[PDB]
Amino acid sequence: KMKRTIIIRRNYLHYVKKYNRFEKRHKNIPCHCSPCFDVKEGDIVTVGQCRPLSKTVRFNVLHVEKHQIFGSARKQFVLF
Amino acid sequence: DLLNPDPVEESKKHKLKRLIPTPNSYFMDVKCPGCLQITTLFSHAQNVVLCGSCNIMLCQPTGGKCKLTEGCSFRKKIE
Amino acid sequence: VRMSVLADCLKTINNAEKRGRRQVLIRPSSKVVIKFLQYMQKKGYIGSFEIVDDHRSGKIVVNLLGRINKCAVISPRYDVKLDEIEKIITSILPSRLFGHLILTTPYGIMDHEEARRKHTGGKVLGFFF
Amino acid sequence: GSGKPSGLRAARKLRIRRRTQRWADKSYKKSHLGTRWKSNPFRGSSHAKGIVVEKVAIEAKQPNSAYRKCVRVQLIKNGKKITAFVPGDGCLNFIDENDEVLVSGFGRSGHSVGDLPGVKFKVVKVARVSLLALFKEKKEKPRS
Amino acid sequence: RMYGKGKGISSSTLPYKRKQPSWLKQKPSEIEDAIIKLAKKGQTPSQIGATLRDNYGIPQVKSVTGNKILRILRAQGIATTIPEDLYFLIKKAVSMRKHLEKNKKDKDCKFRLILTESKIHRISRYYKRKKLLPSNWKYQSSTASALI
Amino acid sequence: SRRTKKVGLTGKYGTRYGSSLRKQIKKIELMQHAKYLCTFCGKTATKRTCVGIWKCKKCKRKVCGGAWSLTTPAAVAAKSTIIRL
RNA sequence: AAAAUUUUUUGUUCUUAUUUUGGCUUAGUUACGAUUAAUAGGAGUAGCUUGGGGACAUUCGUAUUCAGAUGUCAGAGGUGAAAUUCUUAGAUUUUCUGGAGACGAACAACUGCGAAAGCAUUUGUCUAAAAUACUUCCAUUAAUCAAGAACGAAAGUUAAGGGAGUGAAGACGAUCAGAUACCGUCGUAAUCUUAACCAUAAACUAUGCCGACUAGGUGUUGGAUGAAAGUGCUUCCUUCAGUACCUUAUGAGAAAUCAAAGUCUUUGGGUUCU
RNA sequence: UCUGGUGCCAGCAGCCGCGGUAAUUCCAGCUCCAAUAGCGUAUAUUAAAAUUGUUGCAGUUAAAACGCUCGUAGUUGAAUUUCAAAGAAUCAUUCUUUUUAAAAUCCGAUUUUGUUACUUUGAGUA
RNA sequence: CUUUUGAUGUUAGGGUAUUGGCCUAACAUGGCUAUGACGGGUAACGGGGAAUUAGAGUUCGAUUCCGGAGAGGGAGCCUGA
Numbered sequence A: 001k002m003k004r005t006i007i008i009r010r011n012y013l014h015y016v017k018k019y020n021r022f023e024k025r026h027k028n029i030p031c032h033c034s035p036c037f038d039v040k041e042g043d044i045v046t047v048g049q050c051r052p053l054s055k056t057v058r059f060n061v062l063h064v065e066k067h068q069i070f071g072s073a074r075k076q077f078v079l080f
Numbered sequence B: 001d002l003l004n005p006d007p008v009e010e011s012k013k014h015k016l017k018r019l020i021p022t023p024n025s026y027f028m029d030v031k032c033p034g035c036l037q038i039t040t041l042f043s044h045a046q047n048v049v050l051c052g053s054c055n056i057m058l059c060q061p062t063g064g065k066c067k068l069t070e071g072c073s074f075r076k077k078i079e
Numbered sequence C: 001v002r003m004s005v006l007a008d009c010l011k012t013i014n015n016a017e018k019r020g021r022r023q024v025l026i027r028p029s030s031k032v033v034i035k036f037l038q039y040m041q042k043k044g045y046i047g048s049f050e051i052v053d054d055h056r057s058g059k060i061v062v063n064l065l066g067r068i069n070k071c072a073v074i075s076p077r078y079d080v081k082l083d084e085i086e087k088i089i090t091s092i093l094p095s096r097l098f099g100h101l102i103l104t105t106p107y108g109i110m111d112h113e114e115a116r117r118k119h120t121g122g123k124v125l126g127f128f129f
Numbered sequence D: 001g002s003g004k005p006s007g008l009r010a011a012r013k014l015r016i017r018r019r020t021q022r023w024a025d026k027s028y029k030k031s032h033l034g035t036r037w038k039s040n041p042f043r044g045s046s047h048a049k050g051i052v053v054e055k056v057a058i059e060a061k062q063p064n065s066a067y068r069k070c071v072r073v074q075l076i077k078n079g080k081k082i083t084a085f086v087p088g089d090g091c092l093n094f095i096d097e098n099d100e101v102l103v104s105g106f107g108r109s110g111h112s113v114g115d116l117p118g119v120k121f122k123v124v125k126v127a128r129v130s131l132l133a134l135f136k137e138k139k140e141k142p143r144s
Numbered sequence E: 001r002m003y004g005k006g007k008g009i010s011s012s013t014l015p016y017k018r019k020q021p022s023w024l025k026q027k028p029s030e031i032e033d034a035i036i037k038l039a040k041k042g043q044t045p046s047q048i049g050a051t052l053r054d055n056y057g058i059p060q061v062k063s064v065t066g067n068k069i070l071r072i073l074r075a076q077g078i079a080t081t082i083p084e085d086l087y088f089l090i091k092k093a094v095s096m097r098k099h100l101e102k103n104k105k106d107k108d109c110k111f112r113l114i115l116t117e118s119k120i121h122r123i124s125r126y127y128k129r130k131k132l133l134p135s136n137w138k139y140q141s142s143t144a145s146a147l148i
Numbered sequence F: 001s002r003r004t005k006k007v008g009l010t011g012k013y014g015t016r017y018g019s020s021l022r023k024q025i026k027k028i029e030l031m032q033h034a035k036y037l038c039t040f041c042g043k044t045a046t047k048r049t050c051v052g053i054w055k056c057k058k059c060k061r062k063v064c065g066g067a068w069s070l071t072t073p074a075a076v077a078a079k080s081t082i083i084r085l
Numbered sequence G: 001a002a003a004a005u006u007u008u009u010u011g012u013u014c015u016u017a018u019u020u021u022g023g024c025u026u027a028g029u030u031a032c033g034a035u036u037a038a039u040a041g042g043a044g045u046a047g048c049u050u051g052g053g054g055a056c057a058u059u060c061g062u063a064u065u066c067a068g069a070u071g072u073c074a075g076a077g078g079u080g081a082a083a084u085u086c087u088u089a090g091a092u093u094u095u096c097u098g099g100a101g102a103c104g105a106a107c108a109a110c111u112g113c114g115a116a117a118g119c120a121u122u123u124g125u126c127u128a129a130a131a132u133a134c135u136u137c138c139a140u141u142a143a144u145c146a147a148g149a150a151c152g153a154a155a156g157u158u159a160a161g162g163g164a165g166u167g168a169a170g171a172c173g174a175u176c177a178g179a180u181a182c183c184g185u186c187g188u189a190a191u192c193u194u195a196a197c198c199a200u201a202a203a204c205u206a207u208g209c210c211g212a213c214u215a216g217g218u219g220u221u222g223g224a225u226g227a228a229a230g231u232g233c234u235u236c237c238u239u240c241a242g243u244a245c246c247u248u249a250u251g252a253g254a255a256a257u258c259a260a261a262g263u264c265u266u267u268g269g270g271u272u273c274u
Numbered sequence H: 001u002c003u004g005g006u007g008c009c010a011g012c013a014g015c016c017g018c019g020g021u022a023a024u025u026c027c028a029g030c031u032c033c034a035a036u037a038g039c040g041u042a043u044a045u046u047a048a049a050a051u052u053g054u055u056g057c058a059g060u061u062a063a064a065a066c067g068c069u070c071g072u073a074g075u076u077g078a079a080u081u082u083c084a085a086a087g088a089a090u091c092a093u094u095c096u097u098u099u100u101a102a103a104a105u106c107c108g109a110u111u112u113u114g115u116u117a118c119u120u121u122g123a124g125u126a
Numbered sequence I: 001c002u003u004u005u006g007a008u009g010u011u012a013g014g015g016u017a018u019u020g021g022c023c024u025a026a027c028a029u030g031g032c033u034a035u036g037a038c039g040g041g042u043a044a045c046g047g048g049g050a051a052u053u054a055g056a057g058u059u060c061g062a063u064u065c066c067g068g069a070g071a072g073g074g075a076g077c078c079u080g081a
């Protein structure tokens, strides 16, 4: 929804020693998206670190992979 | 003992409970008197079946095996 | 709903063994069950067994020798490192001289002594005394 | 099952269940509750000093029969008033109207002990000489 | 069952021999043409299978040809936009809703209608995850009656 | 946005008359100002013109009915009785 | 279709070609190209299949009470015993006629249906739900579920009806040392219907839900299969689903007891709540 | 189960308790016991506590199954796709060799054949 | 919850030893959250570590070394690498 800027979500599992089990966690990362890409909510992107470009952004997109989803983006769990 | 069950006992249980599940139904050749035509039929048929030559009823649906018309003769199909 | 076919098989075997039944039937089968049964066979805990072939998930019949004390699974298949075998075996097995703990390993299914001999870890499946 | 989740990714549920259920334990709730800094004359210490205000006698609980000797003390630290027991056969007449004493706990920290109803403190020193060395009476005499 | 308390086990069971019987005589083209003609008349796949079993001699379609009924009905561009069982569920729901419009004091009917709509939503989610239904297919409860 | 939590239509009365009288007015006037199906032409366009007269905005027929609604139950019961005979 | 090593013409450069390559249109050739059908789930078809499952409309019955007659004459009620109460202006009692509102005896069960709360006169319409039978269709579509939602006895609250019997309050008459009680004579709200609230019970099997295994017998409710007495129906034998009881447990418990409250220091099938 | 004194008083006692003439428990004398240049008391904290329970608790009657059903997030989910087979090294066991479908690649030939979790071994570290 | 008074981005500059809403003008409506945002409490400086424990765990760490912050409480400034 920004101009040449996107938000991506990373999912991962965290280990808890006392119970010998795992948990689901997540973090958000803002990135820069050049107009040579055509993205939308639900796809998969690969990003690389650069120098700070604003108060929050430090990455920008290098490759896009089309991916179809059926619920809402925040409710999907993909691990990589 | 368990590998080679008595065939009388096996054929005497529920179809889903025997070692190899097998149905209880079959197909058969039916002949009605004085029409001179042979027709395939399924035991436990759900529809009403009319003869090819004349529109004479050959069976009636029930809650189990179909009711075969009076005087008709049936013979199992070999396989 | 099943959620596991290994647990049901092992529970049925254990229940029949407690009564001295000399034969038992396992309804749902799979390759993992076959491998577990073969490993029990190799240690002389059971006799021979058949696989009955219907056109569904098959069935198994086994021969028992009045010789098993216990057989069960560990439901969550915890991931075990090579240097953590000692604690698990101390907690689970009845002695240091007999009994077996079964791991699944990147080199197949095997007990703990063979896992040490091969220098490998894995996850836990179950055990039999 | 047995009422707990046993999955490989069910650690949050177990952690939160244990976090909520600790508060039902009396010892835990006692040692983690913010008001213990307020409803406690010693405010966390083991001893305190005060000025004697009155001498009293207290009845024993029902099956027993006696008159136990105590003093009422006003604490220097915060001005509160407490009641303390004077141990010994005739140790009460070692104490005057307003002297300075040390008092400590009485063995069951938050609780009353034995036969005295509602006394949780005990005198250990008077006029900065030991009550025991003064009752032994073969050691020291009060600084008149 | 999924909602009530029943635990029945009644069902049909297939024979061990997967090949077609020796006494069967028709040609696969004839059976496919019968499928197409009998679906032209406005029947559903389950009705088609039942009629083939009874009024013709074909124990199983898959033994004679190589495909199932829905696949061959689709190979000709004849299949409906909405699957069979979902349509039956929708029809039951619209009937119950009409009756309930006529009677505001049925409390059992309200209960059963809630249960059927839950079924509808679950099956619709499954069919949308596959590409069998368009992604913006929603089932409004007020316009479903005109759906044919 | 939603401009009112409770009073809905009776917000024209302000704070007067008491809450329960406003509630009864609300119940009556919800029926009084609604639309009703015309059985003659099929459209839902029948509205009240006076205390007993109802009229369809499309076909322009006039039907005699109730005071605040188009039908009252007591007349429906008698009509059903006669029609059953 | 867009660039070429290799010679070409020029001192700024001009004059041309085999020369190394992605697709398109069509004919052609492949071993050309889709795992079962779960004693998982959902749909379907069949039976003069079952049921006090639900909603609306209809139909019947004695009893009770009111009013009208009807014949007779001194008590009737009620209690452990009596009062209060009705009555020669005819009580109570017997016969007939009309109205009113609730209720649905006997049959009726260690029997049926529903998620629970609950459901019982006849007939019609509407509406769902199992179970059984199946060589019908789809192919994992499922289990349990914070938040959220639908229902939810009796009492109680709001409005309009209805108002016989029963009867929290209240008034008397008795018993008693006292009796604001237990007993008796009256009797208001309520109890019933329509439209809205309230959301609680020893709302109990004081036993969450799904799946597997483990023991013998006697019944009973609803289907299907195979066989005998009948005067296309009854009995018997199997099998599926529901529902009780008895005996016994090198099974369990602190015990009472339990076919689950068993398969647990030989401790881990899945999941919610406390 | 020693002596003297006191007599529900004085007092002791973390807990159960002792104390009215016989007090093994108060106050003393004697004698014994424990640790010992050390030994008591108060407050806090760990084990004991499988009385916080992942390993590892209980929920008919002891504390504790929501009145009942639906339902999102969460947790958990049937079987199937290369299974084998034949020699060597050891006092049946443990090890170790040999190839059996395919396509691309050295004039009847070497070497490549999806991504994570998970597990093995390293690097780096006051 | 944040956003009139910079909250989240784009463009052009200013400034700094350099990147950056760090600041200024124009523009757009974004950013975080039941996987706990925004708030409250701490008798909370963080580690290397300590005590007690068969194995799990529970509780401490102002205080030898490393990192941070301050010189009664706040703000400003000169010299100088």
Ligand SMILES: [Mg+2]
Pocket (backbone or CB within 6 Å): E002
């Ligand atoms: Mg469910």
Ligand SMILES: [Mg+2]
Pocket (backbone or CB within 6 Å): G037
């Ligand atoms: Mg199936």
Ligand SMILES: [Mg+2]
Pocket (backbone or CB within 6 Å): G100
């Ligand atoms: Mg009346």
Ligand SMILES: [Mg+2]
Pocket (backbone or CB within 6 Å): none
């Ligand atoms: Mg009355």
Ligand SMILES: [Mg+2]
Pocket (backbone or CB within 6 Å): none
């Ligand atoms: Mg009365």
Ligand SMILES: [Mg+2]
Pocket (backbone or CB within 6 Å): none
């Ligand atoms: Mg309650």
Ligand SMILES: [Mg+2]
Pocket (backbone or CB within 6 Å): none
């Ligand atoms: Mg309860």
Ligand SMILES: [Mg+2]
Pocket (backbone or CB within 6 Å): G265, G267
């Ligand atoms: Mg244990």
Ligand SMILES: [Mg+2]
Pocket (backbone or CB within 6 Å): none
């Ligand atoms: Mg502790």
Ligand SMILES: [Mg+2]
Pocket (backbone or CB within 6 Å): H049
């Ligand atoms: Mg503990």
Ligand SMILES: [Mg+2]
Pocket (backbone or CB within 6 Å): none
């Ligand atoms: Mg322990």
Ligand SMILES: [Mg+2]
Pocket (backbone or CB within 6 Å): H057, H058
């Ligand atoms: Mg306990």
Ligand SMILES: [Mg+2]
Pocket (backbone or CB within 6 Å): none
């Ligand atoms: Mg319950």
Ligand SMILES: [Mg+2]
Pocket (backbone or CB within 6 Å): none
């Ligand atoms: Mg600005």
Ligand SMILES: [Mg+2]
Pocket (backbone or CB within 6 Å): I061
């Ligand atoms: Mg520190």
Ligand SMILES: [Mg+2]
Pocket (backbone or CB within 6 Å): none
């Ligand atoms: Mg320092």
